Design a protein around this motif. Structure first.
Motif, PDB file in Angstrom:
ATOM      1  N   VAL B  24      33.838  48.708  38.631  1.00 27.90           N
ATOM      2  CA  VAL B  24      34.859  48.923  37.977  1.00 27.90           C
ATOM      3  C   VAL B  24      36.150  49.106  38.900  1.00 27.90           C
ATOM      4  O   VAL B  24      36.971  48.556  39.250  1.00 27.90           O
ATOM      5  CB  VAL B  24      35.077  49.593  36.815  1.00 27.90           C
ATOM      6  N   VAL B  25      35.905  50.285  39.797  1.00 25.24           N
ATOM      7  CA  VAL B  25      36.997  50.774  40.747  1.00 25.24           C
ATOM      8  C   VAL B  25      37.042  49.710  41.881  1.00 25.24           C
ATOM      9  O   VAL B  25      38.214  49.650  42.391  1.00 25.24           O
ATOM     10  CB  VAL B  25      36.380  51.985  41.194  1.00 25.24           C
ATOM     11  N   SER B  26      36.182  48.955  42.084  1.00 25.34           N
ATOM     12  CA  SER B  26      36.347  47.429  43.106  1.00 25.34           C
ATOM     13  C   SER B  26      37.335  46.664  42.222  1.00 25.34           C
ATOM     14  O   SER B  26      38.262  46.452  42.630  1.00 25.34           O
ATOM     15  CB  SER B  26      35.000  47.108  43.378  1.00 25.34           C
ATOM     16  N   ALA B  27      36.761  46.300  40.975  1.00 26.56           N
ATOM     17  CA  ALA B  27      37.496  45.199  40.331  1.00 26.56           C
ATOM     18  C   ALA B  27      38.751  45.862  39.762  1.00 26.56           C
ATOM     19  O   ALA B  27      39.809  44.996  39.391  1.00 26.56           O
ATOM     20  CB  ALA B  27      36.614  44.715  39.352  1.00 26.56           C
ATOM     21  N   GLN B  28      38.919  47.215  39.548  1.00 23.36           N
ATOM     22  CA  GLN B  28      40.208  47.937  39.456  1.00 23.36           C
ATOM     23  C   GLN B  28      41.326  47.520  40.570  1.00 23.36           C
ATOM     24  O   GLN B  28      42.423  47.518  40.320  1.00 23.36           O
ATOM     25  CB  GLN B  28      40.245  49.040  38.890  1.00 23.36           C
ATOM     26  N   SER B  29      40.625  48.146  41.556  1.00 24.28           N
ATOM     27  CA  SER B  29      41.504  47.892  42.908  1.00 24.28           C
ATOM     28  C   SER B  29      41.727  46.437  43.382  1.00 24.28           C
ATOM     29  O   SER B  29      42.726  46.045  43.881  1.00 24.28           O
ATOM     30  CB  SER B  29      40.605  48.526  44.087  1.00 24.28           C
ATOM     31  N   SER B  30      40.875  45.506  42.951  1.00 25.52           N
ATOM     32  CA  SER B  30      40.952  44.251  43.434  1.00 25.52           C
ATOM     33  C   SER B  30      41.946  43.476  42.492  1.00 25.52           C
ATOM     34  O   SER B  30      42.886  42.366  43.134  1.00 25.52           O
ATOM     35  CB  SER B  30      39.571  43.504  43.512  1.00 25.52           C
ATOM     36  N   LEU B  31      42.004  43.961  41.319  1.00 23.71           N
ATOM     37  CA  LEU B  31      43.080  43.739  40.532  1.00 23.71           C
ATOM     38  C   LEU B  31      44.520  44.190  40.664  1.00 23.71           C
ATOM     39  O   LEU B  31      45.617  43.566  41.053  1.00 23.71           O
ATOM     40  CB  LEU B  31      42.852  43.954  38.895  1.00 23.71           C
ATOM     41  N   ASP B  32      44.293  45.561  41.041  1.00 17.91           N
ATOM     42  CA  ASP B  32      45.832  46.091  41.638  1.00 17.91           C
ATOM     43  C   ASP B  32      46.195  45.769  42.754  1.00 17.91           C
ATOM     44  O   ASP B  32      47.244  45.781  43.331  1.00 17.91           O
ATOM     45  CB  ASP B  32      45.463  47.818  41.658  1.00 17.91           C
ATOM     46  N   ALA B  33      45.421  45.059  43.609  1.00 20.88           N
ATOM     47  CA  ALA B  33      45.826  44.418  44.888  1.00 20.88           C
ATOM     48  C   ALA B  33      46.347  43.006  44.489  1.00 20.88           C
ATOM     49  O   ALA B  33      47.256  42.556  45.274  1.00 20.88           O
ATOM     50  CB  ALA B  33      44.506  44.254  46.110  1.00 20.88           C
ATOM     51  N   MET B  34      45.980  42.523  43.365  1.00 17.68           N
ATOM     52  CA  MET B  34      46.631  41.412  43.064  1.00 17.68           C
ATOM     53  C   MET B  34      48.097  41.723  42.190  1.00 17.68           C
ATOM     54  O   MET B  34      49.128  40.956  42.611  1.00 17.68           O
ATOM     55  CB  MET B  34      45.925  40.602  42.110  1.00 17.68           C
ATOM     56  N   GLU B  35      48.227  42.785  41.716  1.00 22.76           N
ATOM     57  CA  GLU B  35      49.419  43.125  40.870  1.00 22.76           C
ATOM     58  C   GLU B  35      50.442  43.694  41.817  1.00 22.76           C
ATOM     59  O   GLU B  35      51.715  43.320  41.996  1.00 22.76           O
ATOM     60  CB  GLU B  35      49.325  44.004  39.658  1.00 22.76           C
ATOM     61  N   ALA B  36      50.060  44.336  42.724  1.00 19.21           N
ATOM     62  CA  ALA B  36      50.714  44.444  43.973  1.00 19.21           C
ATOM     63  C   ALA B  36      50.714  43.321  44.729  1.00 19.21           C
ATOM     64  O   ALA B  36      52.083  43.324  45.630  1.00 19.21           O
ATOM     65  CB  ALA B  36      50.294  45.647  44.721  1.00 19.21           C
ATOM     66  N   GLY B  37      49.889  42.527  44.937  1.00 18.14           N
ATOM     67  CA  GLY B  37      50.071  41.285  45.577  1.00 18.14           C
ATOM     68  C   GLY B  37      50.927  40.275  45.214  1.00 18.14           C
ATOM     69  O   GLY B  37      51.709  39.443  45.753  1.00 18.14           O
ATOM     70  N   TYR B  38      51.044  40.100  43.878  1.00 19.55           N
ATOM     71  CA  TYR B  38      51.803  39.142  43.185  1.00 19.55           C
ATOM     72  C   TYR B  38      53.278  39.521  42.935  1.00 19.55           C
ATOM     73  O   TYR B  38      54.248  38.718  43.019  1.00 19.55           O
ATOM     74  CB  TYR B  38      51.404  38.755  41.813  1.00 19.55           C
ATOM     75  N   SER B  39      53.360  40.912  43.011  1.00 22.64           N
ATOM     76  CA  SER B  39      54.974  41.320  42.803  1.00 22.64           C
ATOM     77  C   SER B  39      55.601  41.191  44.140  1.00 22.64           C
ATOM     78  O   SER B  39      56.991  40.980  44.094  1.00 22.64           O
ATOM     79  CB  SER B  39      54.841  42.902  41.990  1.00 22.64           C
ATOM     80  N   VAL B  40      54.805  41.263  45.156  1.00 17.98           N
ATOM     81  CA  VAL B  40      55.531  40.899  46.510  1.00 17.98           C
ATOM     82  C   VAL B  40      55.159  39.532  46.846  1.00 17.98           C
ATOM     83  O   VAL B  40      56.314  39.016  47.568  1.00 17.98           O
ATOM     84  CB  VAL B  40      55.027  41.883  47.522  1.00 17.98           C
ATOM     85  N   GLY B  41      54.439  38.695  46.210  1.00 16.39           N
ATOM     86  CA  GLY B  41      54.320  37.437  46.308  1.00 16.39           C
ATOM     87  C   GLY B  41      53.157  36.926  47.374  1.00 16.39           C
ATOM     88  O   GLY B  41      53.021  35.309  47.297  1.00 16.39           O
ATOM     89  N   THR B  42      52.176  37.505  47.586  1.00 18.26           N
ATOM     90  CA  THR B  42      51.322  36.907  48.431  1.00 18.26           C
ATOM     91  C   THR B  42      50.235  36.172  47.868  1.00 18.26           C
ATOM     92  O   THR B  42      49.685  35.307  48.191  1.00 18.26           O
ATOM     93  CB  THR B  42      50.654  38.069  49.487  1.00 18.26           C
ATOM     94  N   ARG B  43      49.852  36.581  46.569  1.00 18.54           N
ATOM     95  CA  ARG B  43      48.850  36.108  45.918  1.00 18.54           C
ATOM     96  C   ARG B  43      49.413  35.593  44.789  1.00 18.54           C
ATOM     97  O   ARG B  43      50.485  36.048  44.147  1.00 18.54           O
ATOM     98  CB  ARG B  43      47.815  36.924  45.520  1.00 18.54           C
ATOM     99  N   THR B  44      49.013  34.490  43.939  1.00 17.29           N
ATOM    100  CA  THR B  44      49.733  33.798  42.842  1.00 17.29           C
ATOM    101  C   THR B  44      49.196  34.464  41.637  1.00 17.29           C
ATOM    102  O   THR B  44      48.452  35.288  41.596  1.00 17.29           O
ATOM    103  CB  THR B  44      49.316  32.398  43.142  1.00 17.29           C
ATOM    104  N   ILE B  45      49.686  33.865  40.494  1.00 11.74           N
ATOM    105  CA  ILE B  45      49.156  34.305  39.354  1.00 11.74           C
ATOM    106  C   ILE B  45      47.983  34.078  38.764  1.00 11.74           C
ATOM    107  O   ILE B  45      47.356  34.417  37.847  1.00 11.74           O
ATOM    108  CB  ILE B  45      50.464  33.761  38.250  1.00 11.74           C
ATOM    109  N   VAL B  46      47.297  33.020  39.389  1.00  9.74           N
ATOM    110  CA  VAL B  46      45.973  32.537  38.909  1.00  9.74           C
ATOM    111  C   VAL B  46      45.059  33.359  39.894  1.00  9.74           C
ATOM    112  O   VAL B  46      43.830  33.763  39.225  1.00  9.74           O
ATOM    113  CB  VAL B  46      45.877  31.137  39.288  1.00  9.74           C
ATOM    114  N   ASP B  47      45.277  33.963  41.029  1.00 15.86           N
ATOM    115  CA  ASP B  47      44.612  34.828  41.701  1.00 15.86           C
ATOM    116  C   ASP B  47      44.641  36.390  40.975  1.00 15.86           C
ATOM    117  O   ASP B  47      43.553  37.244  41.352  1.00 15.86           O
ATOM    118  CB  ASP B  47      44.915  34.907  43.235  1.00 15.86           C
ATOM    119  N   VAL B  48      45.665  36.319  40.215  1.00 13.70           N
ATOM    120  CA  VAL B  48      45.813  37.598  39.453  1.00 13.70           C
ATOM    121  C   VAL B  48      44.545  37.786  38.366  1.00 13.70           C
ATOM    122  O   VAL B  48      43.803  38.517  38.058  1.00 13.70           O
ATOM    123  CB  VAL B  48      47.155  37.751  38.922  1.00 13.70           C
ATOM    124  N   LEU B  49      44.917  36.492  37.453  1.00 13.63           N
ATOM    125  CA  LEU B  49      44.120  36.159  36.330  1.00 13.63           C
ATOM    126  C   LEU B  49      42.622  35.966  36.590  1.00 13.63           C
ATOM    127  O   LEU B  49      41.593  36.399  35.953  1.00 13.63           O
ATOM    128  CB  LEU B  49      44.793  35.234  35.482  1.00 13.63           C
TER     129      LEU B  49
END
Lengths: 53, 49
Positions: B24-49
């Motif tokens: 979980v702590v990986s996939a919580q961090s990997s998700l939160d690397a996306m939400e911080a990554g999508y809010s700044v724009g490097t990763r897309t909304i599908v790499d979020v989902l």
């Protein structure tokens, strides 16, 4: 694809670079034509006064 | 055999939890690397989902 999904705005803006960058490269090459156009049709007559040769 | 089985199942299942709780702590961090990554724009909304 902006706003919607895949484009991941930086990977858009990495291509918005490349448009704005390579259009600037055209501006280099379009003037590089223009330097070599004003060495081609730059032959000669007259010197831009209008008078009696 | 049966008593040692469940006792060696739950000893597996504790270490299973501290695996999948870390997963979980990986996939919580990997998700939160996306939400911080999508809010700044490097990763897309599908790499979020």
């Amino acid at each position: 694809l902006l706003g919607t999904q895949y484009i991941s705005k930086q990977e858009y803006d990495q291509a918005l670079a490349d448009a704005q960058q390579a259009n600037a490269a055209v501006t280099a090459a379009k003037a590089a034509v223009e330097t070599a156009r004003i060495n081609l049709a730059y032959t000669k007559v007259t010197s831009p006064i209008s008078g009696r040769i | 055999q049966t008593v040692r089985s469940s006792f060696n199942n739950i000893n597996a299942s504790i270490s299973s939890i501290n695996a999948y709780k870390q997963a979980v702590v990986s996939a919580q961090s990997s998700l939160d690397a996306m939400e911080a990554g999508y809010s700044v724009g490097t990763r897309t909304i599908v790499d979020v989902l």
